[PDB]
């Protein structure tokens, strides 16, 4: 009575998850109508079932968000026992506060929408701010890429015992100090004032830029130059969410990165074809395991510091 | 105390409404971030004000819906006294029942999202099903294009007194009989055999007017027009309140035998009127502006029905 | 842990349902106090149980509605695992819109009342408008009489392959075309302007008036005359809900119907005694089966086009 | 800005209230359809108005309750600014606890239905249990008949200074001690042995006044009166705020030894006063009208307590 | 999958309950931060578990209430299957109405807080007013001390067949008549006007003052004098909740009580050390049994008139 | 129409606010019953009024929180038009995430309790995390001490133009870079090795100003000051908006090398300034009073940011 459904035609990650659980993805008719309205029909009974819907990897976020909400709704009114939204990269997470401005908190609205659509549980990876768990009243499991990142560092960078973990911004300090302490190495922080400042020593060390996401990549690219200017041996960037919109791929191809490392929370295949610096960490096992534990009532806490 | 804001790049209807009320549209930045995420910034204080957000006309339904919800949210947490969503064409209204499938009721989800976003009131025109009003617990005013459609028929069709109001499908029966009763004329109905088309009612030697709440790809309305011609209708008109016209619609209309296709201003038509000569629009900005002023003043809105 | 309860002293339908499930109806003290207030007490534990309450067949709708709400409430606060309202004929369904008027949407209020009383699930047959499912946030199963109606037609009307399915009003068009297409026959539509108009051919054919309900029967009786005037061979009327209030029974006894066919969503025994034209389709098996499937997490979709 | 509407055929209390406020009752059609379903139609715009619906006095509790809820709903979706339910006698108030049974708390269900219907405020008189106020999250004003009952006792009973205020049962203890303390007089209590009746307190050679929130079949109050007579009470009175008087109540009172039975105007009594001479009514329309005006004006309503 | 947790360091009652169920109390870090903020961490997984949290016996009610709410919250967002608040003595129960005053109904706010914190079920003993069950929408089990009180009376007071059960106030009448009828004895009632009045005969009989709680004990102490003045042979006081704040212990030591009997809904050990008149009825078995039944879907109604 | 009430025995901030608005504090009895239960009684009618409750300064966080919630509840069921909670230092704000533990989000629970109590609006100062605003669905105005802190630095520190704004931990990075950018000065950060302290950034031969949202036991801030001294900082200041100062805090500060510790008026400091000479307070009553007046009048509150 566990049922996994995928969004749109980006089965990629959701197929890996379903594979790892020994399951076929449930039958869904999932497209757009002529007037661009989202079209969904659940192709099998979900009555009394433990349902998991994995958010599509299309790229048009509002389409994918609506598709997800519509799928949640269809399953809830079709008498699913429980519906869990598996949202590897949480949409609108960077709008999680007003910022001294007359702005929306779109991440709270998104939480409210998921809730009224009928979500009983959220599974996500590396929320932009941990406080977003509090934007819901339903339980959220915020998985970490940290264990898989630590693992990637230790087996891919020889100098890891003498590297510096660097935040590209002021907001990422906690995350980098946390990784630096686990590895027992130094940390540094970049802050943009339209000019960057670096605090911390990177001289004659490998520098690893660590952030939760990379979008247009303006920031990591400038930070990498800054670090080389400060005497870093070579620069890596490791993000969980590889968004890479706009000129990101052009920017990465022209930057001084040894490698840009991301998870597959977002589909990366097409971006990798035009960008050889990108390497992907498969996190499908961490997601599959969290679903399996969720379903069985077993500890998901294991995953926060352990790689399956 | 009153503030009107518009969604994104379409401002034409919103401007017309603001004009009729002696107001400038509120300043707002409505864009998309690099990654396609909707960006909204309310450019002025809305604290203690009666706010009206008029839904955009920028085609991408999900972007327009998210933009609307975000605007509502931003206004509500910025201490607006009241927030009304003015949504001329209600999105997802055709998904208002399961229809024997394991389907979503997307129109109820939309109602729930608008409500949780913080809408206190909905103003809309010709809901696909009048029951959608009950998908909310907040008040909805469902305005009708009918009086204006009635006006247009009497004013533009010379043989209107001996005409037939035709429904493109089985579902639109009540809509056309209402119009046929008002004009004291005949009605007829078309149905697709579940496909061949069947017509019930007399259209021979008389002007046939196809009436429906909306026309999308216009496949139904264009096939219906052929069938009405074969049945000996003098000339065929198509009158829809919501002119979506997506996909092959414009090419289909031009190839069809329509004397005229009449739509309201609920969706922008300017772009489509340029490539389709037989389209005429009824301006409905006065109905909407008048519902906003009357909503704000506590005056009767039923007069407009 | 399935428990069926019945409303008031009209056990009739609910006893048939309980019979078909191999169950006795749960013990309820269910009456009115002296001041006409509804009196309910659940005579056995419902703690952790899957509870089904079938709406009474009394006739005083507000009494029956309140009784149902009170029973739902008593079971919810008595720690029932789930409470399902089995409402064969949904009250106030004809007040499902404003109708250009300053009117209530009583069907939405009724939905809101059921929800706040503690209903987790609704089972009903042939909602007056399918959009009423959207008046709830909880799952609703809207069963169809269509399969049993098609079955009744094919085995009771010899001329069924050459009949016309007729809507008594403009609102019933979809329903009749749907039945006409399945049978592969013609459809027609009556519309009242205080004068009726018929569109569609009924000449020298059996006419079957098909609607969701028959109340005072003014409309079906006038439509039957109209159809005979248009050359119909004989007229049948088949409704799911036989309300038959006011002068309906007198009206049917004086009309030109071959037969008036209804379901037992409403008790019909007393009405049949004073009206020989009425025949009943037993739908207790469709209801019993939907409860059994609901309880077991099995497909209720089977019932929408299949007769058990 | 203020509108008072009445429930169904009983308009007497509602008229008295509307009179005291210089208003006509709002026009509304309150009927039943052929199949017993409650029909309601608000005959005028309530948009932006402060609406008060006064619960009917047409006996059938479930019809009256549904009529009230439907009226509230119709007003709320018709964009009333605020809707207050004025419910002199709160329905289902005696079902306010489980009482060791697998029973409903019907009074909470009623509170929940009123709230979901869209009531913003409740005005009522002498709730069976004062805790019912907490069955809502909306404000409730619970008015008391006590000051008017006190007035009536002093005004109509000559030996009131040496009288005893008697409770018909164990539950009504706090109600009678409150009244006995206010008049500086004795109290006593009756209890049914779980039946024989037991009396605690002195009533010998003094006027006994039975006080309770309500009298329904009047079996308790009539048996209590007999027991009070056997205990040597000079004369026995019965004073209840809510005079339901269902079933054999009227015949029971006439056969009983009551000097007078006093009730308020919370339920219509005119019909019953014709067949029962000893019933007197305290008009409470002024208390209710005054709570409505004060609710509307933001003035103190506690003065009326 | 039953898990019992206790509040603060007053494991006392909760340990007895856990003992009787064959369980160890779940691991909780439960204290105050330096700024007096409540500190909680659930020391084990509660995912998919049936969770019971027993309210602490500290004495600082607002601390204990917040601790409970915080524990409920932590368990709910940690994916507990169900969370039940076991609140032997319900806080703020004496603020269950306005009382002709511009007062809060704090007991309703407390109910609303428990509900929004994530409580699915309440287990309590002898609510100050039964109407407080209606302050919730979730099921409440209001257990009675009555069976254990009747038992205590019959085996500790020889003259029980000829005693008088006395209410210390007007509000306790129903409770005492109920006990008096079961025992088949007389009842009496005290009412404070700043002077007490007694109605009912206590002359040459054992008088038992019965109330739901004893706080400062001003009222029971004055009532006991009054009863002796009226000719009672000896006076007992039996309350379910022994609060005994302020000068209660001094007051009881100086009063004419044969004995003051309370339950262990509140810890009593320290109070008994300074007051020899106090005897305790252990109600841990009634609570343990209600939890066990709750968990198993078995009848809790048994406990309302039966002692396990 | 406006009413300001204060929580319990601390009235100093509340008086200052009421003074600035030309008002007396509303009469309210805020005590504890014998058994430690919070007692509240609203001493006047709040019916139809815009009510502001200013959170107490009586140290016991749970008593103060319950007192606030009870006051809100009493006002809401007493038919206040609107209830705003003015909470200078938001309780449980540090518990705003799970932080890898099976922990509560106590700040969300608090948000939910305030909301269910009946708060319509929150006014607070320097939320520990700005995301706490989204723990509500009601509007929150999050005021900043920053402009006043900026003023104090320029006004009281002579070498401010060549100074360094230092963060006591990793988390406070964004707070100090904001201040360093505004003054056009350097920033630095301290981190505890997970313990030895590490400093990143230049502080040698320049005045170092430790800035944080709050200081509790002051262990972090005092150890940070030592490390800043060892790194050759001329003089060290500590500036916090919320000066909790619990436990050994006062003794720690006196033993530390601080030139001055600056806090706002969000928590009472009078008692602590008597035993700690280096503490200076910025009065923030004008910011709060001004947000209340502007909230009430519908005027811009963003001006104060
Ligand atoms: N999809 C997006 N792409 C780029 N920037 C965004 C997006 N959503 C929000 N923002 C902005 O990013 C900032 C969030 O700050 P932080 O959370 O500290 O990175 C805010 O100023 C937002 O306006
Ligand atoms: N945006 C849309 N475009 C085309 N068809 C739709 C859309 N939304 C819903 N539908 C379908 O339209 C069909 C008929 O709707 P109706 O005319 O209301 O009976 C249903 O089967 C829906 O699945
Ligand atoms: N119980 C009832 N009996 C008769 N008519 C009703 C009832 N409830 C609602 N109506 C009316 O029936 C009409 C519903 O239209 P329709 O849904 O198209 O049949 C509305 O005008 C209602 O006022
Ligand atoms: N309308 C009613 N008529 C008669 N008795 C009722 C009514 N509603 C509830 N009751 C019962 O009255 C009894 C006593 O109520 P109370 O006086 O509040 O203790 C309870 O056992 C209820 O079941
Ligand atoms: N913790 C408490 N201690 C003492 N008295 C209280 C407490 N809580 C509420 N009260 C008061 O006790 C009375 C409750 O009345 P009753 O419920 O009849 O005992 C009210 O006047 C309350 O103000
Ligand atoms: N009142 C409090 N006093 C001390 N520490 C707290 C308090 N509330 C939460 N914390 C802890 O403070 C730590 C750091 O919070 P933050 O500075 O937001 O990362 C977390 O691990 C919390 O458990």
Q: Which residues of A touch C293 (CB under 8 A)?
A: 47
Structure tokens at F82: 């609107």
E148 secondary structure, DSSP code: H
Task: Tell me the pairing of strands F164-167 and F186-192.
Answer: parallel
Q: Which helix (H) or strand (E) holds D19?
A: helix D12-20
Contact state of D118 with B140 under an 8 Å Cβ cutoff: no
Among candidates E58, E74, E64, which has minimal Cα distance to E3? E74
Alpha helices in D27-60 (DSSP H): none
Asked if residue A295 has its Cβ within 6 Å of ligand 1, the reply is no
- Alpha carbon of A96 to ligand 1 centroid (Å): 8
Burial class (CB in 10 A: 0-12, 13-18, 19+), D247: middle
Measure the CA–CA gap between F188 and C305, rounded to whole angstroms.
Answer: 73
How many angstroms separate the alpha carbon of residue C33 from the centre of ligand 4? 9
Cβ contact, residue pair C173, B177, below 8 Å: no
In 3D, which of D89, D154, D63, D86 has the Cα closest to residue D294? Answer: D86
Pull the structure tokens for residue D132. Answer: 């019912």
Chains that touch E (3 or more CB pairs under 8 A): A, C, D, F
Distance D167 CA to ligand 4 centre (A): 16
- Given an 8 Å threshold on Cβ–Cβ distance, is A47 in contact with C299? yes
Return the residue whose CA atom lies nearest to atom 23 of ligand 1: A95
Is residue D38 within 8 angstroms of chain C, CB to CB? yes
Query: Which residue ranges have their beta carbon within 6 Å of ligand 3?
Result: C 94-95, 99, 171, 215; D 33-35, 37
The whole-angstrom separation of Cα D294 and Cα D288 is 10
HSE-CB of A151 using CA atoms within 13 angstroms: 15
Within 174-193 of B, beta carbons closer than 8 Å to A belong to none
- Residue A132 tokens read as 């977003």
CA of C303: how far to CAs of C142, C153, C289, C293, in Å?
10, 18, 8, 10
The helix/strand count (H/E) of chain D reads as 9, 14
Q: Cα–Cα distance between D162 and D143 in angstroms, integer?
A: 28
Distance of CA A172 from the midpoint of ligand 1 (Å) = 14
- Contacts for B181 with CB less than 8 Å, ≥ 6 apart: C193
Task: Tell which residue, F260, F250, F295, F251, has the closest CA to residue F82.
Answer: F295
Which residues, in sequence order, are bridge partners of residue D200? D189
DSSP symbols for F155-168: HH-TTGGG-EEEES
Is residue A296 within 8 A of residue A286, CB to CB? The reply is no
C-alpha–C-alpha distance, residues F268 and F91, integer Å: 15
Token pair listed for E49: 């578990």
Q: Token pair for residue F86?
A: 């003015």
Q: Which residue of E has its CA nearest to A84?
A: E79
Instruction: Outline which parts of chain D fall under CATH 3.40.50.2020.
Output: 1-144+283-303, 145-282
For residue C123, the chain A residue with the least C-alpha distance is A79
- Listed in sequence order, the DSSP H helices in chain E are 12-21, 61-77, 106-117, 146-156, 173-183, 218-229, 248-253, 269-273, 284-296
| Residue C141: strand, helix, or coil | strand
Interface of B with A in 8-37 (CB under 8 A): 34-37
Of the candidates C161, C106, C147, the one whose C-alpha atom is nearest the C-alpha of residue C128 is C106
Q: Quote the ligand 5 centre to E97 CA distance (angstroms).
A: 9
Measured in residues, chain B has a length of 305
Q: DSSP letter at C26?
A: P
Resolution at which this structure was determined, Å: 2.2
Q: Where in chain E is the domain with CATH 3.40.50.2020?
A: 1-144+282-302, 145-281
The residue of chain E nearest to residue A296, with distances taken between CA atoms, is: E48
Distance of CA E283 to the CA centre of its chain: 10
From F59, F90, F94, F129, mutation site for ligand 6 pocket: most ligand atoms within 8 A of C-beta: F94
Indicate yes or no: CB of C96 within 8 angstroms of CB of B134: yes
List CB contacts of A283: < 8 A, sequence separation 6 or more. Answer: A88, A125, A143, A145, A148, A263, A264, A265
Q: Cα dist. E211→C4, D136, D188, E86, E170 in Å?
A: 40, 28, 20, 21, 11
Nearest CA among F97, F166, E249, F112 for reference residue A137: F112
> How far is CA C187 from each of CA B196, C166, C206, D17, rounded to the nearest angstrom?
14, 6, 11, 57
Q: Give the strands of the sheet with A82-87, arranged side by side.
A: A2-6, A50-54, A82-87, A121-125, A140-143
DSSP 8-state assignment for residue E27? P
**Nearest-CA neighbor of F27 among F88, F79, F87, F75?**
F75
Is the shortest distance between the CB of A99 and ligand 1 below 6 Å?
Answer: yes
Residue F139 and residue B45: Cβ atoms within 8 Å? no
A7, A32 Cβ separation under 8 angstroms = no
Q: Name the CATH topology of B1-144+283-303.
A: Rossmann fold (3.40.50)
Nearest to E239 by CA among E181, E176, E299, E287: E176
Long-range contacts of F94-99 (CB under 8 A, 24+ apart): F94/E37, F94/F128, F95/E37, F96/A130, F96/A131, F96/A134, F96/F128, F96/F129, F96/F131, F96/F132, F96/F135, F97/A129, F97/A130, F97/A131, F97/A133, F97/A134, F97/F129, F98/A130, F98/A133, F98/A142, F98/E77, F99/A130
For residue B170, list chain C residues with Cβ-Cβ distance below 8 A: 173-174, 176-177
Cβ of C92 under 8 Å from any chain D Cβ?
yes
Residue F11 labelled as part of a binding site:
no
The residue contributing the CA closest to ligand 3 atom 8 is C94
Q: Determine how many CB atoms are found less than 10 A away from the CB of residue C136.
A: 20
- B contact chains, 3+ CB pairs < 8 A: A, C, D, F
Strand locations in chain B (E): 2-6, 28-32, 38-42, 50-54, 82-87, 121-125, 140-143, 164-167, 186-192, 197-200, 208-215, 236-243, 260-264, 279-282
Contact F295, B79 (CB under 8 A): yes
Q: Closest Cα partner for F254 from F273, F282, F228, F270? A: F273
In the sheet that holds D260-264, the strands lie side by side as D197-200, D186-192, D164-167, D208-215, D236-243, D260-264, D279-282
CATH number of the domain located at residue range(s) C145-281 in this protein: 3.40.50.2020
Contact E70, F106 (CB under 8 A): yes
DSSP, collapsed to helix, strand or coil, labels residue D164 as: strand
For C264, list phi and psi in degrees, rounded to 5.
-95, 35
Q: What are phi and psi of C79, to 5 degrees?
A: 70, 25
For residue D304, the distance in angstroms to the closest alpha carbon of chain F comes to 14
d(CA E87, CA C7): 35
Q: How many CB atoms lie within 10 A of CB B266?
A: 28
C32 forms beta bridges with: C38
Q: Is E102 within 8 Å of F45 (Cβ atoms)?
A: yes
Q: 3-class secondary structure for A37-66?
A: CEEEEECCCCCCCEEEEECCCCCCHHHHHH
Q: Got the DSSP string for A100-121? A: TSS---HHHHHHHHHHHHT--E
Distance F238 CA to ligand 6 centre (A): 20
**Per the CB < 8 Å rule, is C294 touching A79?**
yes
Quick check: D123 and D288 in contact, CB under 8 A?
A: yes
Atom of ligand 5 nearest to the CA of F37: 1
Cα-Cα-Cα-Cα dihedral sign, residues B224, B225, B229, B232:
positive
- The tokens for D88 are 């002199």
> What gap in Å lies between CA D52 and CA D86, rounded to an integer?
7
Distance CA A297, CA A2 (A): 13
Ligand 1 site, residue B36, Cβ cutoff 6 A = no
Tell me the nearest-neighbour CA distance from C77 into chain E, angstroms: 4
Q: Is F125 helix (H, G, I), strand (E, B) or coil?
A: strand
- Tell me how the structure was determined: X-ray
Q: Of the bound ligands, which one is closest to the alpha carbon of residue C99? A: 3
Cβ of A171 less than 6 Å from ligand 1:
yes
The rounded distance, in Å, linking the Cα atoms of F13 and F1 is 21
Closest C-alpha to E189, from E204, E207, E206: E207
Residue A263 CA to residue A240 CA, distance in Å, equals: 5
* Separation CA A145–CA A283 (nearest Å): 8
Identity of the residue in D100, D131, D142 whose CB atom sits nearest the CB atom of E131: D131
Contacts of B108 in chain C (CB under 8 A): 134, 137
Report residue E36 as tokens: 């007096």
Task: Give DSSP secondary structure letters for A271-308.
Answer: HHHT-TTEEEE--HHHHHHHHHHHHHT--SGGGGT---
Residue B297's CB: how many other CB atoms inside 10 A?
12
Q: Are C33 and E281 in contact (CB under 8 A)?
A: no
**Nearest neighbour of F47 by CB, restricted to D137, D140, D298:** D298
CA dist B97 → A73, C105, D50, E188 (Å): 12, 17, 36, 64
- Residue B159's alpha-carbon distances to B212, B241, E109, E212, in angstroms, are 20, 22, 69, 86
Q: Are F37 and E245 in contact (CB under 8 A)?
A: no
Chain D residue numbers touching E189 (CB-CB < 8 A): 173, 189, 200
Whether the CB of F217 sits within 6 Å of ligand 6? no
Ligand nearest to the CA of C215: 3
Element at E280 (helix H, strand E): strand E278-281
Instruction: Give contacts of D81 with chain F, Cβ < 8 Å.
Output: none
Q: Does D247 touch chain E (CB under 8 A)?
A: no
> Does C74 contact D246 at a Cβ distance shorter than 8 Å?
no
Contact yes or no for D177 and E170 at CB 8 A = yes
Please name the helix (run of DSSP H) or strand (run of DSSP E) that holds residue D39, with its range, or none: strand D38-42
Q: Which residues contact C150 (CB under 8 A, 6 or more apart)?
A: C179, C182, C183
Residues lining ligand 4, judged by CB closer than 6 Å?
C 33-35, 37; D 94-95, 99, 171, 216
CA distance E299 to E290: 9
Chain F touched by D299 (CB under 8 Å): yes
Q: Does C79 touch chain E (CB under 8 A)?
A: yes
Contact E47 A133 (CB under 8 A): no
Q: Note whether F8 and F56 are within 8 A (CB).
A: yes
Ligand 3 center to C95 CA (angstroms): 6
Residues in chain C: 308
112-131 of D, contacting E, C-beta below 8 A: 112, 129-131
For C41, the closest chain D residue by CA position comes to D103
Task: Nearest chain F residue to A106 by CA: give it.
Answer: F134
Q: After which residues does chain C break, using C–N > 2.5 Å? A: 193
Taking every pair of Cα atoms in chain F, the longest distance, rounded to a whole number of angstroms, is 61
Question: Among C215, C38, C241, C245, which residue's Cα sits nearest to residue C124?
Answer: C241
Q: In sequence order, what are the residues at sequence separation of 6 or more whose Cβ sits closer than 8 angstroms to the Cβ of residue A39?
A: A29, A30, A31, A32, A33
Instruction: Say how many Å lie between the CA of residue F127 and the centre of ligand 6.
Output: 14
Could you say which of 3.40.50.1100, 3.10.20.740, 3.40.50.1860, 3.40.50.2020 is the CATH number of the domain covering F145-282?
3.40.50.2020
- Kindly report the CATH number that applies to the domain delimited by C1-144+282-302: 3.40.50.2020
Q: Between chain A and chain D, are at least 3 CB pairs below 8 A? A: no
């Amino acid at each position: 009575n566990i049922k996994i459904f995928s969004g749109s035609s980006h089965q990629d990650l959701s197929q890996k998850i379903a594979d790892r659980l020994g399951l076929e993805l449930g039958k869904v008719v999932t497209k757009k109508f002529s007037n661009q309205e989202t079209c969904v029909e659940i192709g099998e009974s979900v009555r009394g079932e433990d349902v998991y819907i994995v958010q599509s990897g299309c790229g048009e976020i509002n389409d994918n968000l609506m598709e997800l909400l519509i799928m949640i709704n269809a399953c809830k009114i079709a008498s699913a026992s429980r519906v869990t939204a598996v949202i590897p990269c949480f949409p609108y997470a960077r709008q999680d506060k007003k910022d001294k401005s007359r702005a929306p908190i779109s991440a709270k609205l998104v939480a409210n929408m998921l809730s009224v659509a009928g979500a009983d549980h959220i599974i996500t990876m590396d929320l932009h701010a941990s406080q977003i768990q509090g934007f819901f009243d339903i339980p959220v499991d915020n998985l970490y890429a940290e264990p898989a990142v630590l693992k990637w560092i230790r087996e891919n960078i020889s100098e890891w015992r003498n590297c510096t973990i660097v935040s590209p911004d002021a907001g990422g300090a906690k995350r980098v100090t946390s990784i630096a302490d686990r590895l027992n190495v130094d940390f540094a922080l970049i802050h943009k004032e339209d000019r960057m400042v670096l605090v911390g020593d990177v001289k004659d060390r490998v520098a690893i830029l660590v952030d939760d996401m990379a979008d247009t990549c303006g920031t990591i690219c400038h930070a990498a130059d800054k670090l080389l200017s400060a005497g870093a041996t070579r620069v890596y960037a490791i993000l969980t969410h590889g968004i890479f919109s706009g000129p990101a791929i052009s920017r990465i191809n022209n930057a001084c990165f040894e490698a840009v490392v991301v998870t597959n929370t977002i589909p990366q295949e097409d971006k990798m074809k035009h960008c050889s610096k990108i390497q992907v960490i498969d996190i499908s096992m961490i997601l599959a395991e969290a679903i399996r534990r969720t379903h069985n009532g077993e500890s998901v806490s294991y995953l926060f510091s352990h790689v399956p």
